[PDB]
């Protein structure tokens, strides 16, 4: 009976909440109250990367912390040298509606996708020297919201068809499908060991997936509206989510519950993008009100603000070496901050 | 040395700027359009007629008086639109196609009105004009002339509604057909005249799926949209 199954899930639901409540000794704020505040974090715009015609949804830093790729609705992928502000590549896209971009860790490939429901793979290191499409990964029935390379042959994609997919780029096939979300999957984040990844969806929940087993280990609730952004904490044992409910939250994997909420009464707009600093002490979040807020990840205090962009801050990225932050925006500009 | 590298990098950067400047001229010379409609709106027939005169998303390109129009039709997306609708915040207009004969899914027209309300009052679409196609006009006339419609059953305000004085009936149109037409338009204009605030505009049109005037109707609304934008920038 459907009602019997519906009740059984509800009963187990209560047990998981009781199990989570049993492990709640003290709040992270109680543990952290003796820590010194980080103080006022004052960051300035060191660079403004100009050249995109339309708004930017996505940027991704290279593992060299110097090159970075950005995607604009004008149908362009632009690879920047952030040190010199010189453009290295300008890749025209077949579909102008691009929603995500990824840079491979090796630096040999970039990926992008959007409303065409395709992850396009680009070879940056062709013999002829011209960037060509390596693969088109088809099989998602909804738009791609996020993609992240594992290596030159594997990439993980999240889609508006409520699924995540792991692709073998050479064959162009889905080796694994990750199902269990009921809303659009908006963002994904690989663990530092790339054995697991987390996704945040429009069902206001975040799920932890095992890549090789292709199954959901854990589901995280606490947000009220759609989750737009997600990022692992540097040690890989926690992650942070930004939502349309105008809050950021930190979830601990092993505690299996929400750990802290980042919000203020003056903030009534959703978060579009989140990222940790190199040590994870700072949580940076892009907002709909054109600003980025720097949070003390341990104390839930706004340490600072990035206030340069004239339109929606859509995307965020902190370099691997922790030197700089990039903000992409709907005003078609990339800014670099220290 | 390094100077050979950095001069090479500036040499590559200027080829991109040369190409990006060319791309900018084409981008500003094209008007992008989002075609939104329910499946039973007649929107697919509309795309087909324009194709003979001249997938997660379908694109068609038509040219009216040497002006480029790029129309995008959603395919293979879920009915959840609250995320991917934000991609079209900067199109010239959203072409919203409505089946006007669909009041008798119990009430498709009430669903079309709710969708228009969400589009009109979304924060990211505040500056986006909407061209409203009231499509099944031929079917609306045939239904209301038979006496089986009973619009009052789905819209009780239709009992007390009177045809506005500015109404321009088509030749040979029954006053009942004319009255039913303008009531549904006034359903959409009640939403549009609230919160429009002189930033985005609604251009309703009584269409049919096989009208050859539709591309001209879109062209004339786009030029009106562009002119109003320019006059706003000059504070006129």
């Amino acid at each position, epitope marked *: 009976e459907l009602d019997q199954l519906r009740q059984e899930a509800e009963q187990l639901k209560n047990q998981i909440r009781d199990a989570r409540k049993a492990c709640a000794d003290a709040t992270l704020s109680q543990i952290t109250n003796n820590i010194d505040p980080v103080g006022r974090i004052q960051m300035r715009t060191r660079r403004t990367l100009r050249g995109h015609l339309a708004k930017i949804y996505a940027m991704h830093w290279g593992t060299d912390s110097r090159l970075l790729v950005s995607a604009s609705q004008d149908g362009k992928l632009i690879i920047w040298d952030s040190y010199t502000t010189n453009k290295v590549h300008a890749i025209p896209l077949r579909s102008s509606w691009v929603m995500t971009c990824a840079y491979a860790p090796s630096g040999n490939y970039v990926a992008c996708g959007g409303l065409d429901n395709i992850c396009s793979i680009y070879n940056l290191k062709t013999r002829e020297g011209n960037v060509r499409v390596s693969r088109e990964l088809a099989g998602h029935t909804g738009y791609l919201s996020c993609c992240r390379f594992l290596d030159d042959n594997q990439i993980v994609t999240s889609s508006g068809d409520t699924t995540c997919a792991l692709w073998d780029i050479e064959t162009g096939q889905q080796t694994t499908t990750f199902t269990g979300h009921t809303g659009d999957v908006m963002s994904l984040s690989l663990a530092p060991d790339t054995r697991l990844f987390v996704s945040g969806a429009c069902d206001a929940s975040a799920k932890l997936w095992d890549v090789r087993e292709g199954m959901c280990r854990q589901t995280f609730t606490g947000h009220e509206s759609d989750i737009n952004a997600i990022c692992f904490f540097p040690n890989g044992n926690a992650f942070a989510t930004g939502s349309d409910d105008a809050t950021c939250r930190l979830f601990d994997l092993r505690a299996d519950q929400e750990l802290m909420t980042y919000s203020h009464d003056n903030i009534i707009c959703g978060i579009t993008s989140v990222s940790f600093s190199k040590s994870g002490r700072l949580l940076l979040a892009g907002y709909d009100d054109f600003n980025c807020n720097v949070w003390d990840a341990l104390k839930a205090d706004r340490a600072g603000v990035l206030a340069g962009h004239d339109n929606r801050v859509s995307c965020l990225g902190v370099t691997d070496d922790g030197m700089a932050v990039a903000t992409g925006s709907w005003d078609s500009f990339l800014k670099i901050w220290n | 040395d390094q100077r050979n590298e950095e001069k090479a990098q500036r040499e590559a950067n200027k080829k991109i700027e040369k190409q990006l400047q060319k791309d900018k001229q084409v981008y500003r010379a094209t008007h992008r359009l989002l075609l939104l409609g329910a499946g039973e709106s007649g929107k697919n027939t509309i795309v087909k007629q324009m194709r003979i005169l001249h997938s997660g998303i379908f694109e068609t390109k038509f040219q009216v008086d040497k002006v480029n129009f790029h129309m995008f039709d959603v395919g293979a997306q879920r009915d959840e639109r609250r995320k991917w609708i934000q991609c079209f915040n900067d199109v010239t207009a959203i072409i919203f196609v409505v089946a006007s004969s669909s009041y008798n899914q119990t009430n498709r027209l009430q669903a079309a009105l709710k969708l228009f309300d969400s589009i009109w*009052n979304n924060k990211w679409l505040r500056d986006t004009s909407v061209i409203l196609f009231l499509n099944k006009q031929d079917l609306l006339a045939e239904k209301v002339l038979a006496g089986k419609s009973k619009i009052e059953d789905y819209f009780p305000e239709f009992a007390r509604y009177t045809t506005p004085e500015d109404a321009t009936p088509e030749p040979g149109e029954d006053p009942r057909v004319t009255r039913a037409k303008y009531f549904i338009r006034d359903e959409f204009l009640r939403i549009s005249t609230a919160s429009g605030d002189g930033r985005h505009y609604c251009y309703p049109h009584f269409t049919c799926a096989v009208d050859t005037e539709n591309i001209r109707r879109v062209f004339n609304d786009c030029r009106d949209i562009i002119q109003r934008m320019h006059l706003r920038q000059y504070e006129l």
Partner: nanobody
Amino acid sequence: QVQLQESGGGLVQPGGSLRLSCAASGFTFSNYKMNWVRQAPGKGLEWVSDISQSGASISYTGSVKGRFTISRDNAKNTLYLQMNSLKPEDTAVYYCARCPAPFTRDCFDVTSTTYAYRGQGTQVTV
């Protein structure tokens, strides 16, 4: 966790009233615009009524005008639908749906087939 629980449905003869209650939890109830939607047998989901954050602005589908009344109590986090003089075509499963984002005039997708912020409806047969 966002949860909506509907109650008060039943079997009623035509012309008899029912009062539906929606118990809400897992979000700030006062920040959201609430909705009532139905699904008749063999048909799609249909929007019935909505109420704004404070309860001031109210809308109905034409078929229930002057017949159904929507009410909210922010203090108790409850949504109400008092249905009077029911008709046989009011027979449906009634869902309490919440608008997806807070502080928004627009309300997208509440009638979608797999909308998340919707309860498991209560059956009403007339």
